[PDB]
Design an enzyme around this catalytic site. Structure first.
Site: not given
Ligand SMILES: CCCCCCCC/C=C/CCCCCCCC(=O)OC[C@H](COP(=O)(O)OCC[N+](C)(C)C)OC(=O)CCCCCCC/C=C/CCCCCCCC
Lengths: 48, 151, 52
Positions: B29, B51, B103
């Protein structure tokens, strides 16, 4: 002419078996590919 | 530690790519180009299911990749922004500990080996449930708690 | 009219019994915390987990 002429589907030779063989082989390979894809989706739908 | 790389954007870092074993982990992402020049040139295979974006490490020159493991006994772990506690099938943190833009941060066990890579978190009030990409004995898995947002 | 009415009512009773069976075979799994419903039973009884 002392007869009539109509559409193709009822006029093809009995040696139209080539059409059946080719269509059946293509349908078989397509069905096998679809089955394999369905199986792969099934495990991929249960691994998450 | 210090084996991770920030995936850089025009003006800020949006995520972190981690080196695990022989693979260059990177969440999918997050978008960017990665800081290190050589790593930016590898072919990153993607997967919207997990992902993730990973590529074979140039192990001929990168011999510093973090160790990994598959077992996740319940306990306490650390992720460079505090300590992550295990419970059931969730990772929880103090609500303010997690932030967007970080992240892909690897999280280790007590022996210095990664077990999961955080994708995002859901604020549950006092605790924040982490959405992580871990792996069992054989294959990766994506634990996504309800209402988890990307980071 | 009579035959059509009862037959559709018969299939309605059948679908109602199916729904009742689904309810009574799925509620134990719904009450129990942990939510360990197997993939097979989810597909058979047409339910989905909280992590998918
Ligand atoms: C190894 C394998 C070997 C096997 C090989 C097998 C061989 C394959 C054979 C087929 C044999 C066909 C024999 C049947 C023919 C008799 C049909 C018929 O009796 O007709 C003949 C008429 C007579 O000619 P006329 O001068 O009176 O008419 C024109 C009038 N004038 C001139 C003023 C314009 O000719 C017409 O009228 C026809 C006019 C319309 C014809 C065009 C058809 C349009 C079809 C479009 C298909 C669209 C694709 C679909 C894709 C959708 C995506 C899924």
């Amino acid at each position: 002419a002392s007869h009539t002429t109509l559409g193709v589907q009822d006029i093809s030779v009995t040696a139209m078996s080539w059409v059946q063989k080719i269509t059946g082989g293509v349908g078989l390979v397509v069905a096998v590919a679809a089955l394999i894809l369905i199986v792969v989706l099934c495990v991929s739908f249960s691994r998450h | 530690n210090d084996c991770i790389f920030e995936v850089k954007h025009e003006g800020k870092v949006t995520g972190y790519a981690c080196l695990v074993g022989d693979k260059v982990m990177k969440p999918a992402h997050v978008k960017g180009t990665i800081d290190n020049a050589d790593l930016a040139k590898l072919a990153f295979k993607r997967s919207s299911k997990y992902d993730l974006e990973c590529a074979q490490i140039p192990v001929h020159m990168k011999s510093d990749a973090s160790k990994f493991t598959h077992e996740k006994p319940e306990g306490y772990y650390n992720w460079h922004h505090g300590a992550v506690q295990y419970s059931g099938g969730r990772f929880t943190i103090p609500t303010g500990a997690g932030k967007p833009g970080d992240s892909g941060r690897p999280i280790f066990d007590n022996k210095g080996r990664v077990v999961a890579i955080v994708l995002g978190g859901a604020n549950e009030g006092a605790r924040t449930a982490l959405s992580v990409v871990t792996w069992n004995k054989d294959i990766v898995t994506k634990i996504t708690p309800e209402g988890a947002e990307e980071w | 009219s009579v035959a059509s009415f009862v037959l559709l009512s018969m299939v309605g009773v059948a679908v109602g019994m199916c729904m009742c069976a689904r309810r009574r075979c799925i509620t134990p799994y719904e009450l129990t915390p942990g939510a360990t419903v197997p993939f097979l039973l989810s597909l058979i009884c047409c339910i989905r987990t909280a992590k998918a």
